[PDB]
Amino acid sequence: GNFSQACYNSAIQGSVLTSTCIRTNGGYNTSSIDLNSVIENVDGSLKWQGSNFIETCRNTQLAGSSELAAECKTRAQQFVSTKINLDDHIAAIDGTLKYELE
Amino acid sequence: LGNFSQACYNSAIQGSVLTSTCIRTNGGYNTSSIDLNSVIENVDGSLKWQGSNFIETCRNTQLAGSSELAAECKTRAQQFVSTKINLDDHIAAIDGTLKYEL
């Protein structure tokens, strides 16, 4: 992960993270990744290893350099604040944002 | 051709993201990932190629065997069925990187 260490002017809109990242050999590339592919809402908490958090979460924001903040519905249907560190699994690979397992 | 599974190993599915470790012509290997949500559609509960966005209406994605995406998806009438699709149809590995083909 650790995309934030090579990237700049990151933004979250709905489920999409977009950033501008330093390419391996120099210069910059801009790319987007749909976080809905890899994050789920488990009882009001954003978690890795699932998908479709956006179905039941709203008001997504980038907090600081690398955190996705949102309000997600608990099983009781109460919106609650939740955050997840995108640096856990999102890498910058030659200036392009990619999900990383290992 | 697709057929990434013959070039790759240690494959996994998390949300809509396929990760796999694929052979490099230099004699090494590269771990990469692809968002299958760009290329797979939920059509009335069945996973199909020639579309996108299946994660919005499916759940419990899993890799079955070496190359099958399995999931539970909502029909147009909003009931869940189990469905599968052979990722080897269109997912290829080119020099250690997963790519969509044709």
Curated annotation (Swiss-Prot), chain A:
One Gene Ontology biological process: regulation of defense response to virus
UniProt-listed InterPro entries: Cyanovirin-N, Cyanovirin-N_sf
Covalent S-S links between cysteines: 7-21, 57-72
Transferase is among the record's keywords: no
Modifications the protein undergoes after translation, according to the UniProt entry: Cleavage, or reduction and alkylation of the disulfide bonds results in the loss of anti-HIV activity.
SMART domains in UniProt: CVNH
Protein family membership: Belongs to the cyanovirin-N family.
Something else known: Its activity in situ is unknown, however it acts as a viral entry inhibitor, inhibiting HIV-1, HIV-2 and simian immunodeficiency virus (and some other viruses such as feline immunodeficiency virus, measles virus and human herpesvirus) infection and replication. It prevents essential interactions between the envelope glycoprotein and target cell receptors by binding to carbohydrates on viral protein gp120 and possibly by other mechanisms as well. Addition to cells must occur before or shortly after virus addition.
Protein name: Cyanovirin-N
